[PDB]
Amino acid sequence: VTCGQVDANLAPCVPFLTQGGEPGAACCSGVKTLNGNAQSPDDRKTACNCIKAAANRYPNLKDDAAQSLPSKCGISLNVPISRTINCDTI
Numbered sequence: 001v002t003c004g005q006v007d008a009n010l011a012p013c014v015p016f017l018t019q020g021g022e023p024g025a026a027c028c029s030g031v032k033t034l035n036g037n038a039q040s041p042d043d044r045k046t047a048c049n050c051i052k053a054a055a056n057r058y059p060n061l062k063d064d065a066a067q068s069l070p071s072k073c074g075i076s077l078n079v080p081i082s083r084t085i086n087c088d089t090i
């Protein structure tokens with residue numbers, strides 16, 4: 001896991017994460033790839049920190065979009081999309 005790969009995976013989620021609505025196929029696919037790549041505790045902690053960085057790019061981030069993404073994509077998300085998560089607890 002690198003932050004560049006996290007950014008690539010989550011890029012198609014940016015409109016949903018910033019405007020609400022539904023994630024869409026490309027976003028759900030991106031998140032499933034990420035979730036697939038966060039296979040170890042280290043990978044998960046690393047991904048968590050990169051996702052937190054990404055989430056903190058957008059002053060207009062919709063936290064409830066972020067919170068609804070796993071249910072809308074049908075996945076158990078190992079690394080939640082959050083601006084404030086402490087990644088040590090992942």
Ligand SMILES: CCCCCCCCCCCCCC(=O)O
Nearest residue numbers: 025026028029032072073074075
């Ligand atoms: C369970 C994941 C396998 C699906 C692989 C690509 C799916 C992309 C569209 C995602 C929509 C959610 C599907 C689902 O997990 O039920």
